């Protein structure tokens, strides 16, 4: 009933000029993604899945897993799926984006400078008072609510991006520089890749024989390891089912109890 | 429609003991604080007022003032309204409350080690996974939405509680003690002590003749200045109106701009 | 019944001109004020108001204390409520009045010499005799009932207007320029300040921090001591009380027994 | 029946989100400015207005003029009208414009490097190809056909800007200033201040006894000369007509031939 | 219903003559002038105009201003507008008038040696008792009747006419020889010049960059300081309003209160 996607308070607070909400119906499902996934689909080149685990429980045990939207001819930093802090002015273009996505962004990545400039800049406007601080008290106030439930600061499951030492603690440098990364972007790299070797209980599962995307300094990006990219059709003997050729995420490790 | 008490999310979770909700009907209300009246009353010795401001915009412009709930016979400790995190154990004799209560004034007055101390103690209880971790889980993500949207974090109005140079910036011992406590407490805080002078646009308004409650180290305490403790009735020629001489919370000044 | 105001006995005594009879129906009340709260307002800066003493004893005691009706912006001479008899000529012009009201107050004040002067020119009016002399006789009698009744001979309660030897019969320049008003004057500012400090039997109560108004030898004025003058709306979140701003008479000090 | 605003083509080219066409009416008619008055409004704080001379040719010659649109509590920068290249960015605020328009705003200015960054970052986007080249196009076909026809390289009339040898070429510094804004900047601001001198044939006539704005390296600024600025009601004995107070734009000096 | 022109009581009597009454409608309204708008354009070359004023209280605050009717190519004494008592003679032609109208110039001049003259030598016509000495005894009535309503003898709003210690009672020469002129003629001046300069309460509003007219002691002439004459097409792209071009009659300081 209520909307739970950060790109979904989006208004372009000109007093002339319109905006859009097409957020996809999954926006209101608490299903943990902070964002709908038509934005999803539009910023990111990230699609949702569900993913089952037929495990001793016999539940339906349903975890959450991401897809490529980019194919084989791209290369370089268009294959980028969460550009890191550093390296995300290029890719995401942000001045083709109105204010308020500009600063649902910077949020995002947390650039309090950036903050700053745009509310420094954006009171010389006229009307201001009237209804532009309203509004962008509206969306900081609900942007900062989605992003703090998210927060990374441990509540009151252990995952890692990298197989070293799998039995213990140690992480690789992709860990560290994940732990970098804000509330909301942690949560949703967290619910994007899916790890592929899972540790329930005391047993072991692998889904993916071999790690899809990767994790470097300039972020999450689809560029698979040793080898060429893997072929992604995109798109938007009949009687055997399709088994769609999507490319998921997958990477990483994960310890489960109880 | 939806409580914004900090305290209204009161469970006995020890799945056999009940619990209550006794705020009144203004915690649904979006007045500023995020706190019932009747646990205002029964936790901090504070009642809630309102205030009008007849200013030269012939507005009806309401402000939010607070009320003692001491007399005269209790001095000392007994005297504090809202204590700082160095001294507040003893004040609200923590082990008389509940767990959850216990562990919305740690995460008021952000005590971190009480807060690890109370979870890594309470899963020894039996039957913690099947709702208790859920009950935990639902009460701290509610009191964190009510924290985080006071947080002091200057937002994307100016408040002092000393008289020192009141045109300029420079405040006393007691606001750089105030800006110690935590987003809910000085939102609290601010919404309960009205400024005794008041500054819209470029005139002054004196409400109060002299301050009335302190702020000290300790904290929030109704220890009159310079004087004999004020007569308070408690309490819960007929034709002349009554004029209650309930005791406000009058100290400090403020700015206002437009 | 009976009127109890002295200024309710008003009459436009030129035989031909009206008059008015404007008192509100408190003046019939044995109240204690020999005013009535229409005249109390439209002469003096000042308004009734009744306080309650939820003492030891249970009762419902009530008191009488004054308000203000001065706000900000006027200063100096227009900041007086109770003018003493040096300095009355200019604040009240008594040119404005109806001879009734100018040996009213002259009666009040004790100014011999300007009742000698009204009545020795009023004389030689055409028609005196008819009914100008009953008229006047009877307006002076009621006054002087009035006055007589309130005189501060003592009857057959400690009243002090400044904090020095409080637990003593010292006063200071306050009190004693005090007693230099007639008996009607006295009676009107005991009613209409409330003393800041009171004592009951052997405890004792405060319900100002600190004073008000002020007693000068220009009278009773409202001029705050060492601040800027107390914010008066003067006039004439809905859930909470309203708590009105208005200023009330709070000063000096009451010994009282039994 | 075909526009002739520069700020008429404006489109959101995101695929998504719309635009407006806001222009006046008058847009269409060739009066010689090449921006509706509806633009010329929100983006100068300039008016449009027609000017009479009722010369010996007894004929209905209209020249044109502008108008403020600021008043007297605004200061500095927000007095400007039209600003130059050097110290548009701040106000204007580009960035919360759509990029037609900090294009245009740019081809106006004559900024070729924050054309070519927005050229060389705008590909970066999805559907470029598609139509978003296309629209740029015709965007920047139309903006450089506005531009040129407007070029100060003189065709195939003498305007100054100061007061300095009039009956001569010489002027100040102004005017060497002025001859360094674009072709557009350039008519747009001979159209919109008249000259407080105007020489027709071999005669003068003085419309405004001193000027009103003035021109600086910060471009053209209503900031009256050698005083405190002109009162203006800004808004959107009846017999007599209103006789508007509307404060124009005059300024310089005008050689008329023939 | 009644007329308040001076030049309204203009009656030939000569006992075989006619007269007119050309006054505009105007002249019955109670506008504060004292003259009809044809009179006032046919002696003085001044029209009437109204000034509206925006101020802070949002009312409709209506002042009255004038008009020249001179243009460029008439100089010296054929610019005056108002003569001092000097020279007037010459100015006016008073032998072109009729009788009535010299002896109302007199009157508002203040000429009683001519007064005399015309009176003790209109006693030589013939017929002078029938009807002569009535009629001129009316219009000598009501022309003192719209004369002393108009006397500068204070009433029972402060006025300058040069720039000298604004903020002060200090006035120019020009100011001092104003004071000179007669009831009527002060008045005229007063509601035909407008003040370029106004003080509401404790605010300035600036009218006119630099003043139109000139006072000395030729009186109020439409000469303008340090420039060439402005330029007024006396008289009697559709889209945009007209704009006039109509020169007014600004000059001085103005303080008001309340």
Known sequence: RVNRCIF????????????????????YHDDGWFICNNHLIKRFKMSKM????????????????????????????????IPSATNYQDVFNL???????????????????????????LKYTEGFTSNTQRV?????????????????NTFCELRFFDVTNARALRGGAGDQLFNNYSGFLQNLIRRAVAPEYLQIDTEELRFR???????????????????????????SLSGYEEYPTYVPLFLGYQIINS
């Not at 979904?8 to 319109?18: L, N, P, Y």
């Not at 609510?145 to 998210?150: E, F, G, M, V, Y």
């Not at 899809?212 to 072929?231: H, K, M, N, Q, R």
């Open 209 to 235: 024989n071999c790690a899809t995307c990767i994790i470097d300094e300039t972020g999450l990006v689809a560029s698979v390891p040793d080898g060429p990219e893997l072929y992604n059709p995109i798109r």
């Open 50 to 81: 569900v993913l089952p685990i037929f495990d001793e429980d016999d539940n339906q045990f349903k975890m959450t897993i991401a897809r490529h939207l980019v194919g084989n001819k791209e290369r370089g930093i268009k294959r980028i799926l």
């Open 8 to 27: 979904a308070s989006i208004v372009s607070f000109d007093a002339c000029i319109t905006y859009k909400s097409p957020c996809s119906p999954d926006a």
């Open 136 to 152: 962008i008290h509206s969306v900081y106030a609900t942007t900062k609510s989605i992003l703090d439930t998210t927060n990374p």
């Open 95 to 121: 001045n083709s984006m109105m204010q308020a996505e500009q600063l649902i962004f910077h949020l995002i990545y947390n650039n309090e400078n950036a903050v700053n400039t745009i509310c420094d800049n």
